[PDB]
Design goal:
- This is part of a larger assembly, with 4 copies of chain A.
- Chain A is an alpha+beta fold and about 525 residues long.
- The termini of chain A are far apart.
- Chain A has helices at about 5-15, 20, 45-55, 55-60, 75-80, 85-100, 110-120, 130-140, 165-170, 180-185, 190-200, 215-220, 240-245, 300-310, 370-375, 410-425, 430-435, 440-450, 500-505, 510-525; strands spanning about 35-40, 40-45, 65-70, 105, 145, 175, 235, 255, 260-265, 285, 310-320, 325-340, 345-360, 380-385, 475-480, 495.
- Chains in contact: A-B, A-D, B-C, C-D.
- Bound molecules: zinc ion (ZN) (4 copies).
- Chain B: This is HNH nuclease domain-containing protein.
- The PDB classes it as dna binding protein.
- Keywords: Type IV restriction endonuclease, DNA Phosphorothioation, DNA binding protein.
Chain lengths: ~525, ~140, ~500, ~140
């Protein structure tokens, strides 16, 4: 033993008779943790070696790849990512074939002229015939494809495609992997799922003819993304639990699950603070970089890529003292730059991704407010870090006793708020983002004005104890709601304790109070101008 | 009422005792559930809430209260909330002596105030006390 | 998942080789393995019981079973100990009634304090069979093959029943050559073994997760102390002795469960294992210890309410062997008397710091106080006339005097030269101060308010290792007496 | 020189703001530790003398917490100030062993930092003032 090439005979007999009969009565039948891969099929490594005698180190000595059980078909199809529509086009065709009970292995000749038109029309390549050659081979090292008579083919000079010459000459039967084909033939959910994964990503603006030209109309015509998992509302305790169920990594949540679809994770830090921009159902999601000025790298990069093409993504959320859940699909509608604190507790430039929720990835399902806001986006960064300073954030404690600015250089903040407000007032078509996203500069102004106190002159009284996070127990709120036209400026806003805020919002005399607060807001504002 | 649902010729306001008793009975019966559902655990007993409302008559029961308004809501209830000192989530019982009426300000103090812990201890004490005051 | 019936059927058809136990039709099947095969047809057990199947336990380890031999009683352990001595000396597994009787009956008379030893052997000769110890096959082979297990098992039996180890126990029994230097050396865990969870401890040595006080699989008592926050371990200051709070969760604690066992250990002077998890740290079996005094004190339960609680004063010792115990420990017992020293009197739940009050009931002025100081003096005078004072008498701190200082200082430094200190409280709601004696108890100072002083961390550092500590001590001594006397007029 | 147990004028080799020297070495070492694939608990928790030294040359026997209620200038019996150098972002929680992540505190302020009721806000304040104090010595 001392056996090589007798092995191929052994493998051929394993194919001829079948895995069940091969332990009859050659023996073995023990579980194997490690297999032998040949032409997309797995074989029990000890058993094959034993039969080769009667015709691990040894098998690997004779030139066979010995492998651990492959990752799930879902995962592997999900790993097909750009470094690029060639691979997904072939894959999509293959699924369509399997669904239509075509044979597992098919000659190159037929595959070529069957896929090449698809490659031209949907893969935006010029020479489709040549376009099929790359994935026909490259998809083997993605553990999704196999080529019989591999040995007979002659590879290109630089890298690894086979020559067009070599492929046409040897008409090798290639196809999907064994267990994958069987999976697809037995469980149509998996076929629907894998195709739905490949489609958004890659073909999210599903053109007409897809799904017809591919084998996939009967399978997905109704709605393609229905087969995708997780379902909306699936709940998980840990981030780890999510990871066990759908992959990705537990690193800060902008990342792709096993299916390759982007997922953004928002974890509520304390109570009275969710990602949702108030009065609205839309999300203000802070970007990716954890300690310094954030850059268009890693998750932010992917967010930007998603923003450009108008592709949706999964938005996970864990409320305070609660569980995680995939609560909505969402689309990038605007991106901004803001001052915030990193994990090093230091002020820093950070991205604010403004997400609008949608029912599914299918564009046809997105309400008009979303379509309008995407139409208006321009996809370019809005840098609000010029309008305010980290000192103006409630989260940066200070004396200030910076010589430079008096606390009544609040005027600076109020001015920017007015400038911005006026500029928003002359927007002809305003998006719900334009209307409801709150200007930091105006909030910052109210903070500098009130100095940790209620501004309601009828305040019954309120504590000077701070929160666990070291902020006063107050909230800045507009007297005239932004929803009802009110402007996002300091003279329209007021700092209130929980009691007074409750009085304003659902007190019996809410209305009269509104009037008093409107008056005292304007007054307080004008006092700081002279 | 019991609850504040409608604006007492029968009942003294300190026939709160009636409410507290039902609360205890119910609580005991829920305590001996072998497999309790999340409904059994978290759905809140009207009786106990009612008792707390009768016990503190439109006022904050936090003896350190910085102050709170006496204005009512549009619906005619006091701007208070009845809350457990020992959260039902952490095993605490749904009964009046484990509960306390707090203004929005004091409730914020109890939930995410910097001195939440000490306050929990004060409130636990003053709840039991207030409860036992109405039994004699 | 009832399709497991198909998995069971294949286990029968092919055998145990090919296929916590699962019982079906009088046959036992590996629980986890049956669940797995059913999947193709660690929360496994629940899944099988959710299907209509009765789940049985694996046979208890020899260590566990010998550990289950407890009183409701020296007969059973005497026989067992003889049996282990026999197995170690390569005697035959099964022996006749006749020889066992008149070989063990003398041992039974001398060590089992029974009158008729001949009759004494009869009880455990039969009763030990329903303890799954009567030796068995696998047990006899275990003892013959692995002498650690014999040494462990004998040490376990010797620890619980014969902790005082009278001379001529190891021979007379078969065990002198085996136990040799020290009998408890074969016991596990080793001192210093570290575990993450409490569950991890349980996996390794048994008992249960519930309770501070409980017995491990070996049947030896174990007490568990979990440090709640920083700057707070169980150790009573100026010494290495522990103040371990008792067993009852939420209300006035009673001599039941763990406290009961503690009391049983106190009476006979038996040691026990003391586990400890420092703050943000791991568990570890850090010392053996012996109950040296028990007291009653005011504390808070998990319901945040004041409560009567036991204070077990533990003295650490190198091993269970009494010869290894230092003289301070051996003096503290016998002085013990084994009787509860009670709390109230001088000591109201506030009084001390963990219950906030206005005080809302104006019954007591903050300047009584005087009641506390009086009790402190009384207790002090009574301790001052102790002829032989244990380290507990000397270093355990009187709540009443501490309480008094707290009522006096009102969340402030009492050092009149204080550079300044914050009025912010701790997370737990106490002032950032400490009450400390101006004249250390260690150097004879009395445990009374006029010898104590409240200091901020900075002034405390000044007092303790400041360059001018000595002058400061004088100043503090003066101002303590002064402040004390100001509250008496 | 840079160790607290060596009393000195200092120089004239070094001004006290050749602290820059120390901070540089701390960075260089910190970067080299940051790229350790498998870091032992020693790599993670043993404290770099150079960074500690730097904080000592910076603070000059004083609390760096700008809200310090006050602290004594008396030394210990061993002749060191009653202070401690401590990281604002704990090493245990991934914070770097460098001077701009450290701060010199009196016993009081240190207690405030570790178990005060307003621990969190203070950590932000100290992080800020540590960076600030650090950057003041580079220009
Ligand atoms: Zn107010
Ligand atoms: Zn209140
Ligand atoms: Zn002081
Ligand atoms: Zn300080």
């Amino acid at each position: 033993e001392i056996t090589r090439a007798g092995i191929l005979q052994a493998i051929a007999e394993h194919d001829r008779i079948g895995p069940e009969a091969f332990r009859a009565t050659y023996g073995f039948h023990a579980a194997t943790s490690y297999f032998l891969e040949h032409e997309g099929r797995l074989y029990d490594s000890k058993a094959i070696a034993g039969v080769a005698h009667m015709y691990v180190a040894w098998l690997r000595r004779e030139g066979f790849t010995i492998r651990e059980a492959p990752k799930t078909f879902h995962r592997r199809v999900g790993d097909v990512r750009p470094a690029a529509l060639h691979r997904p086009v072939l894959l999509l065709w293959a699924i369509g074939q399997a669904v239509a009970r075509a044979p597992r292995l098919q000659p190159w000749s037929t595959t070529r002229d069957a896929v090449a038109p698809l490659m031209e029309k949907y893969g935006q390549v010029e020479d489709g015939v040549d376009g099929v050659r790359y994935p026909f081979w490259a998809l083997v090292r993605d553990d999704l494809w196999c080529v019989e008579q591999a040995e007979e083919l002659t590879l290109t000079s630089r890298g690894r495609r086979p020559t067009l010459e070599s492929l046409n000459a040897v008409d090798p039967s290639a196809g999907l992997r064994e267990d994958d084909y069987n999976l697809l033939r037995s469980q149509p959910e998996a076929a629907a799922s894998a195709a739905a994964g490949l489609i958004a990503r890659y073909f999210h603006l599903l053109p007409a003819g897809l799904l017809e030209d591919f084998g996939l109309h009967e399978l997905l015509a109704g709605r393609w993304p229905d087969a995708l998992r997780p379902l909306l509302g699936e709940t998980f305790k840990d981030r780890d639990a999510i990871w066990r169920a759908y992959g990705g990594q537990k690193m800060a949540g902008i990342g792709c699950l096993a299916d390759g679809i982007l997922s953004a994770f928002s974890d509520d830090k304390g109570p009275y603070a969710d990602g949702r921009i108030p009065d609205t159902t839309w999300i203000a999601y802070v970007g990716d970089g954890l300690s310094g000025d954030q850059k268009l790298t890693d998750g932010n990069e992917l967010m930007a890529e998603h923003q450009a093409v108008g592709r949706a993504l999964r938005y996970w959320h864990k409320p305070f003292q609660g569980q995680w859940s995939f609560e909505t699909w969402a689309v990038i509608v605007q991106r901004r730059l803001r001052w915030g604190l990193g994990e090093d507790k230091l002020p820093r430039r950070e991205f604010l991704w403004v997400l609008a929720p949608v029912p599914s990835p299918e564009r046809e399902t997105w309400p008009p407010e979303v379509l309008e806001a995407l139409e208006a986006d321009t996809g370019e960064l809005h840098d609000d870090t010029g309008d305010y300073r980290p000192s103006d954030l409630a989260l940066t404690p200070g004396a200030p006793d910076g010589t430079e600015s008096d606390d009544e250089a609040y005027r600076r903040l109020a001015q920017k708020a007015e400038a911005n407000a006026e500029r928003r007032g002359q927007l002809k078509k305003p998006t719900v983002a334009d209307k409801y996203v709150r200007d930091p500069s105006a909030r910052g102004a109210v903070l500098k004005r009130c100095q940790k106190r209620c501004e309601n002159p009828e305040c019954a009284g309120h504590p000077t104890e701070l929160t666990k996070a070291g902020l006063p127990i107050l909230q800045v709120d507009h007297v005239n709601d932004l929803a009802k036209g009110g402007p996002d400026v300091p003279w329209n806003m007021i700092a209130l304790c929980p009691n007074c805020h409750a009085l304003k919002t659902y007190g019996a005399n809410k209305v009269r109070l509104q009037r008093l607060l409107a008056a005292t807001a304007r007054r307080l504002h004008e006092e700081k101008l002279q």
